[PDB]
Amino acid sequence: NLVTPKRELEQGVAFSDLCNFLVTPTVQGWKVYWAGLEFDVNQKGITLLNRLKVNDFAPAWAMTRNLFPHLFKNQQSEVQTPIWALRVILAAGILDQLEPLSGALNLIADWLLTTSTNHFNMRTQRVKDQLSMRMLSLIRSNIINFINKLETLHVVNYKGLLSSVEIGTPSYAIIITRTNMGYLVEVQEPDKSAMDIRHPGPVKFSLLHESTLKPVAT
């Protein structure tokens, strides 16, 4: 034996911080706390995305509607909560640079991204055995790095400066675009079937106001 393990506390804390997605209401909107990271989410942008979807006549929004027709002119797109937008971004932060942790990490990301449950029921006892300060630290570091990358994006522009990132996996495609309001977040099927003009596939999307990630960037 090289080092005596004393891991109960460690595993208890990692389990708590990784497997509980904490949301509480605040005056502005909601505070979210996950993996020891704190985010203030507000309502800004939601009503705009909703109005934007309606097939009414509005020349002022013609360009935006025509820029993202798969979001704004599509009966199968659905606006989600800003909480959802944050969950997608956290998952993307895990997947972005994604050896034994991989499995577990993926699980956590899939939980964040494909469900709205606040507790993550571990699939197997072995994956649960994976929970550690090291896994938590890796996850936080990944998320911070991805937030920093996001903060380098330019708003949609006419000059060819990067304005979006895309994360692909076999189960889904994530696209995150910097707009004047914040991060436009979308999840489409892996083949990106929402992008097909003749029959636009289903797509979930929302907006995370730019106030939310700023303070967590380093």
Domain ranges across the chain? 1-218
Q: Structure solved using which method?
A: X-ray
Q: Cβ(48)–Cβ(54) under 8 Å? A: no
Tokens of 114: 């494909």
Task: Please give the C-alpha separations between residue 215 and each of 146, 183, 210, in angstroms, as whole numbers.
Answer: 14, 15, 10
> For this experimental structure, what is the resolution in angstroms?
2.0
Is 88:185 a contact under the CB 8 Å cutoff? yes
